[PDB]
From a paper:
Structural analyses of free and substrate‐bound forms of this homooctamer esterase suggest that EH7 presents a more opened and exposed S1 site having no steric hindrance for the entrance of substrates to the active site, more flexible R1, R2 and R3 regions allowing for the binding of a wide spectrum of substrates into the active site, and small residues in the conserved motif Y‐X‐X containing the catalytic Tyr enabling the entrance of large substrates. These unique structural elements in combination with docking experiments allowed us to gain valuable insights into the substrate specificity of this esterase and possible others belonging to family VIII.
Residue numbers in the entry:
A (entry chain D), B (entry chain B): 9 to 409
C (entry chain C), D (entry chain A): 8 to 409
E (entry chain G): 90 to 196
The structure:
Amino acid sequence: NIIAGMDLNRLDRIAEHLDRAYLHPGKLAGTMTLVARRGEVVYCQAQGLRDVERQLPVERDTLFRIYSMTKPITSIALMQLYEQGRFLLDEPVHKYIPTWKNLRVYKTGSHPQMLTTAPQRPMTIRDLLTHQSGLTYGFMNRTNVDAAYRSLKLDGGPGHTLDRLIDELARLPLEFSPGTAWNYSVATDVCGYLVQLLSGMSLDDYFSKHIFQPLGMPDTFFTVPAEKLSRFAACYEYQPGDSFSLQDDPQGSAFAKAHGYLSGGGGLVSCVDDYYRFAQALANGGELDGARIIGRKTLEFMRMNHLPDNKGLPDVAIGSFSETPYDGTGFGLGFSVKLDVAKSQTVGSVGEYGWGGMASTNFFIDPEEDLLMVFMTQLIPSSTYAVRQELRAIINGALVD
Amino acid sequence: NIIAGMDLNRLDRIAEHLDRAYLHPGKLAGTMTLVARRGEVVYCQAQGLRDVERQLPVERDTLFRIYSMTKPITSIALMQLYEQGRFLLDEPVHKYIPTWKNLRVYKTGSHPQMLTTAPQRPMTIRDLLTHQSGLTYGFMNRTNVDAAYRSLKLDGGPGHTLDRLIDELARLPLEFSPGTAWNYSVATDVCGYLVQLLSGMSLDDYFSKHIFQPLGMPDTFFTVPAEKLSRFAACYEYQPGDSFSLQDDPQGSAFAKAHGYLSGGGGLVSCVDDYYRFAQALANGGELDGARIIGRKTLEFMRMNHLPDNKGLPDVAIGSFSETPYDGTGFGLGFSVKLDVAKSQTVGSVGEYGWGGMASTNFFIDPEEDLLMVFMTQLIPSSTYAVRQELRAIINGALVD
Amino acid sequence: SNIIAGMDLNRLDRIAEHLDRAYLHPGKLAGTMTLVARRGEVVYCQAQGLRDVERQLPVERDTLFRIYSMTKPITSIALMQLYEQGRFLLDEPVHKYIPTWKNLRVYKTGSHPQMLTTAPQRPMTIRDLLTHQSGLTYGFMNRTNVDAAYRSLKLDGGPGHTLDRLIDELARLPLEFSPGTAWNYSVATDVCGYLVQLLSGMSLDDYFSKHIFQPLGMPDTFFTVPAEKLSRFAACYEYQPGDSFSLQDDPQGSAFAKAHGYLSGGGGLVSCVDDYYRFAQALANGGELDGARIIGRKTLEFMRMNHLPDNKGLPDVAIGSFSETPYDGTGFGLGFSVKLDVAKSQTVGSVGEYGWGGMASTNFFIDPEEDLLMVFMTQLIPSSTYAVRQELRAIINGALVD
Amino acid sequence: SNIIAGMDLNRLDRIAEHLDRAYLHPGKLAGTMTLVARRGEVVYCQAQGLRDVERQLPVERDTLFRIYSMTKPITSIALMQLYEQGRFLLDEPVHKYIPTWKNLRVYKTGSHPQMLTTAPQRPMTIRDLLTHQSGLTYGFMNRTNVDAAYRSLKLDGGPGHTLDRLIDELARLPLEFSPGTAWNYSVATDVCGYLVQLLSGMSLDDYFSKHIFQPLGMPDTFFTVPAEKLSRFAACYEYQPGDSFSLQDDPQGSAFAKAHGYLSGGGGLVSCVDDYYRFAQALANGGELDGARIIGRKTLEFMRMNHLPDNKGLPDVAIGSFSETPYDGTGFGLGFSVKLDVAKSQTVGSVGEYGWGGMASTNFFIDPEEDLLMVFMTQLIPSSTYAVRQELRAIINGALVD
Amino acid sequence: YEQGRFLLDEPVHKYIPTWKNLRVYKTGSHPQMLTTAPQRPMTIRDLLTHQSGLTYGFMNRTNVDAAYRSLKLDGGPGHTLDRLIDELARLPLEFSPGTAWNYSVAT
Ligand SMILES: *[PH](O)(CCCCCC)OC
Ligand SMILES: *[PH](O)(CCCCCC)OC
Ligand SMILES: *[PH](O)(CCCCCC)OC
Ligand SMILES: *[PH](O)(CCCCCC)OC
């Protein structure tokens, strides 16, 4: 039983695996898994519960916090403006954010008496899109700089806005001279701020007009509307013993409020069908059902390794993206990119691109096989289980042409 | 006379060569040689005797000790379970064999007072499939560690079982920190033990159900059944003067008994037609006559060079696989892989994969030319003559398109 | 929507929107002429703003522009036509054809005219001339005592300057470095023009006319603007602080209107978008347009290769301003730049993209992977001022919808 | 417009114009025979000037030429025919077939016959012979005490010389270096010829005739010119100062007209453009011409690969004159040079272009990317004198018009 | 040296002008030896330390010492210092002065 060169009986191992290894033993609440090849959806399965407390099951239309899977959407948004001539990647950020002209590199000291050295060159927009800015994230919990992000709540918090992020970051140091290393950052939240600066629109309006309406994604937003809140999943966090506990109730969630923070880095709620339509648009070279969000050639450029000398993340990453899963994987303008299949120790193709969210949401596009996967669950953090590698083994196992 | 772009008159040089250089001068007892291209068998020749003492000739259906040619079959078996999500290659072995958690690297001393250092990282399943474990073989005869394997008879002997191997190896050191070198090992025997752990079946039953029955291989087994023992060849060993002497009588062979040792590394008896069906299945991307043993993509992954930085065996091998014949040849998940044709000093194609047995059995698959060869003889050891390189010269010489 | 040769014409309209919003309305450029072609079809052609601000005259399709250093690919084609006839080899020493140059030496120290020199490791070759690895320089570089000597002798141009004077003066000057060991943009292409003359027996304007302009149907390309075409000749502007510009060359009163006796293979030509399009399209086709062949397919493929050592980019070998970030991942062949690494260049495009530019902000490229090309004309010195040629690449590559 | 197989025949006429203007009229060469083929079709064939100046005899299509070192590809094919029959392996030691060579040692110091030696890291292999990494040399190298010993023993050729004498004398001489660690052009191909004899049971002239010349229809290729064909045999000339030449070998009373006992796999053959064309075309086709097969398609593909370590060019490994600029970006396989990097070579052509030359300025190449080939015949020693083979490449590649 | 008559870093060709254009051996047999330019001229310090690039006939290693032997520059019938200096002016050096050491007629 074969569609688009995929054995559907082999794809049934996905549901068998998620039941046996995660759902029955109580490691995940529930899952939504979609696989497509050559434009055809060949697998779509909801399993377990979206809300354990209320015994509500996962459905095709269940809404999920996709978190950092927001970043590819923000990256597409900014590259739409690149295609209109609005900026160049090698332009300094301080051309658009002049208060950032004299950013300096951390040397020593605690906030707010941090001493700094001059950088070799100013931060560029390419540095923002590739996380080579020298910016960081509060949750990194490694350096005095991310300690300053936490005391100023730059990851989010009451009264946080993009305007406050840009203003606070102007008076903070960088982990390193821009371009000389890689560190996962609020840089994509800054990219969102640049979409606003250049388009004249707030980020929710830019996304709606130039991405969600054209692709037919009616269930993707920064704020879950009151009338759709019944469909919104609960979020769970890891507990010792391979268990989980309630982390966010859908009723009385900050995702249900219009607080003033539009996070290009982690803000969006979506569903498997909406993210599938985004992913399929990219797999097609930027077009779905006569709507174009990006040029074929612009997207090809975003999918290239933009790290120096075709290095992988572990050759440049100062932190946790140094670890064995990211071996043979580079980074472009908002996507990871597989460079070396054997080195990654995971079956796949050179050029496989995608990203993930910290609640264990994942997607990839294999341009060699014209194959893609969207996986939705709500378990923080994504570092907990290697479910996204097991799914790659089963899905690549189902190719039979 | 040309079939599948091969001149059959040029292929007749095989039989002329094996007669002139080996059979008439009494260097080999007998040979069975098969060549196929694009799904079509273009050469099949039995020559000389399977049993010199009893004057019995080699026939198409003659049974041969294929030894280390068992390893690709064991590798396919374990990768079938990879495709079901049952493990990941970068997982530690001690996750499945917990007694192995505190394995350490040899420093100095004789068994049983060997001193050890901490390894930089624990052994992984990828390390087992690629012989980068730090495990070894008794017959290596190079180090105090392989001396301990010999005094404990871990290569085989009276009362030996997979359960005993895993138990003894838990109290022995490694030649080196896992991943940091290559050394041919009992690792594939351990892979067989993991097929058992994960499937719930003994290895002979897993092979029968998931490989031999589907491919139509009724003459491949760990134990030769009583009613087929008439077809079983004698095994010969090298003697000075380019001669040979009886090493194993087929009547009263340990291969005719069900002793308790199922060797994923060296145990199987087979015939040219059965191994042809396995080889042709691989050449086709894992399918023969509607039966699938492995996914096309999973097999493509096993055929890649899994050595660090695309190095050849001589750049990482601590032992005999360091020598000139293995120049320009890497190693994947149970197969050698040609990297550089000129450097190997042997005609062929980049990507040529296969392996050999210590009784001078050999097979290869050239994925560039869709060409393959199965060669059967019984002369220990395989290091004696370069017959497998002469056959490559003749076979590649017969391509006429 | 409206698609020609796999290009969305609505997406290509962003070119005109961009040049208006970013350059013309704010008064950074006087006027622009932009042409884009793919698979032999012109898919974009737009004049905007003024060719002469003082006289309120608009840019038209037929407006004539100082293309300057975009002369160099034409001179390079001319010399490679003679390579195809067996007249020289690239690894031959220049002094075989210019014997007075046999004892050229490398700058060590001193001011003109008491410059001390060292022996070069090897003599200058013709390949060194075509790739700017000669060790020659330009007066306008303003970096070294050697380019100071070029300026005091007016070797970039000036009253009574001829190719014969350049070759004679260069014989008594030192090189910035031992030939082949570095890259420095130079009068080398002016010397290439002198070699076209030596080998063909013709003056450069006659060689270009007979062997390139007549065959390709380029009637509006010349070293001297004829009296009867001077109405069509654009003014040249130079940058002023505040992202402004001032008159640099009045068309009526221009040295480009006189036959002053310097035929510059490096910077001399005046042309128009249609003439340079026909040259560019000929190259994109492998050296042929409408049955006329200016170069062999294979000879051109050879000119488009990276001729720098060890497949290095300009910043790994360039001693000067071509060291800077825009030329990262870009090499150099026989008269063209060549893109090596798209990500490294930080600009969308294809490996193999070739072309060059003029110091008045004229630019052209040919993408052989996409069979795409662009000719961009404006008159604003210097071209280092604005990154307009990168913005145009972003918009044009953005319009591909295959 | 004459176009055959994507080649402009008007552009190919530049060959004859060039050889007249640059070589024949000025008296640098006596005469030339030039053939060019593409996709199986001969597109150029021109005799020019004289085969014998003293007797005023012109060059004809059927003129016989000393092809010298262009013998080596034929000897290489002969030995690889036996590789295909399983008779040897490339990584086997030579001393397995020539046991007297087991204790060969590397030159340290001293003059013949009191040369001191060191142990080699490994014994010489057959791959070392086919790639000139043996450590053997040639008398005419005139660089080392070892080639001085070759000259005093006349191992390049001389009265009473035979292959049997070469193998016997070489057993008592040292190597320039430990086998595999460098490249030096050598008598190694003469030794390959000796191995064709050892393995086949036939003398080399009989092996060539039966297994190469008869099958391909090459009736005018031999070690000895038969009496009835001596009228067709060209004179050989050597360079004289002033770009002139002098008689080096009279065809009447030539050693090439005698059956002396020396069958040179390295330099012995006389042939003609048509015979060498048939050999070249057989190789361009993958080892087959008009139903006759001399070598397997795959075996030939293996001979055309770079067999130097780490994909190095000749200048990265060559101890001698093949270190110089013309061999930049060129490697070496089993009897052929192989182009690696077109730009680096400074000569138009394709990656994979293979061929070789003779010391009397005979040359051939096969471009497998363009399915193009050339055979060029003249008699002017030495081939290092003029760059005619690079000029011909420029004109021939210039004639591609698809 | 102590009387101020020369300095060690002075070129030899200051005192032996025929030696100004000495060149380094590349290839060939005497008397048709091809040569390359040296990086710097031979100095008196090079003579006193055997870093000249000169050699001795008896070395029996190179084509250059073969030329010394056929010209009997180590000694023999009619040999004088005047003949050594005259013959050495027309011979190549084993290497560019200063870049190696080779025991020689330098003394
Ligand atoms: P992403 O899911 C991080 C985005 C949101 C973090 C703010 C608390 O990382 C993979
Ligand atoms: P294989 O044939 C080794 C098989 C196990 C032998 C144990 C004595 O090695 C190439
Ligand atoms: P080109 O436009 C240099 C032309 C010569 C100018 C001499 C005054 O440089 C990019
Ligand atoms: P070949 O033509 C060398 C032939 C041997 C010459 C014997 C003196 O070298 C390119």
